[PDB]
C-alpha cells in the first residue's frame, strides 16, 4: 500500500515494476509537491531504480513545484553516478530553483568533489552569481572546501584555451 513515490524512494524495485505494469503515464505522476518517482529515487540515491525509470519512460527534465529537479536532488546527495545517468539524457545542467540553488551549487555545498568534477566536465556554468550573491567558487571559498576549490581551478584553466 506504499505509493509509487515511496516505492521509488525506498528502492522497492520489484514492487515498483509490478505497480508500473501498464506502461502508461503513471511513471511521471507528480505528487502534491510536484515530485516525480524519478526525483524521489534520485534524492535517495537509488541508482537501480533511476536506471529502470529512465528505461521505462521517466522524463528526467520535469521540475517540481519550486523548480526542484532530479539532477539537483542527486547533486545534493552526492550521487555522482545518478548525476551521470541524468546528464546522458541532456537535462539542463544550470537549473536555478526557487531555493536559490543549482546542481553545481548543491555539489559544492555538500563537499561532493566527484560530483563537482562530473558537472564541470559536462560544462556547468561557473560565471553566474546565485540569488545569494555567491558564484560556485565564491561558495567553495567561503565554506573552506579546498578540494572543491582545486577541481574548480583545474577546470577554469582549461576554459581559456581553444587548442
Amino acid at each position: 500500500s506504499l505509493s509509487i513515490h515511496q516505492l521509488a524512494a525506498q528502492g522497492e524495485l520489484d514492487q515498483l515494476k509490478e505497480h508500473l505494469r501498464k506502461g502508461d503515464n503513471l511513471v511521471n505522476k507528480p505528487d502534491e509537491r510536484g515530485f516525480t518517482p524519478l526525483i524521489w529515487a534520485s534524492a535517495f540515491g537509488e541508482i537501480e531504480t533511476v536506471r529502470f525509470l529512465l528505461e521505462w519512460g521517466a522524463d528526467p527534465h520535469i521540475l517540481a513545484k519550486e523548480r526542484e529537479s532530479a539532477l539537483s536532488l542527486a547533486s545534493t546527495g552526492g550521487y555522482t553516478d545518478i548525476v551521470g545517468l541524468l546528464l546522458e539524457r541532456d537535462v539542463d545542467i544550470n537549473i536555478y530553483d526557487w531555493n536559490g540553488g543549482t546542481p553545481l551549487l548543491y555539489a559544492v555545498h555538500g563537499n561532493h568533489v566527484k560530483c563537482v568534477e562530473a558537472l564541470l566536465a559536462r560544462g556547468a556554468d561557473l560565471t553566474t552569481e546565485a540569488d545569494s550573491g555567491y558564484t560556485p567558487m565564491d561558495l567553495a571559498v567561503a565554506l573552506g572546501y579546498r578540494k572543491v576549490q582545486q577541481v574548480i581551478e583545474n577546470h577554469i584553466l582549461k576554459l581559456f584555451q581553444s587548442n
Binding site: I39, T76, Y106, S132, Y134, L139
Partner: peptide
C-alpha cells in the same frame, strides 16, 4: 515506513 520528502538545503546557511 514513510520516507521524508526530497529536500534541497539552504546553501548559504551561516554565511555572510
Amino acid at each position: 515506513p514513510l520516507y521524508t520528502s526530497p529536500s534541497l538545503p539552504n546553501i548559504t546557511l551561516g554565511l555572510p
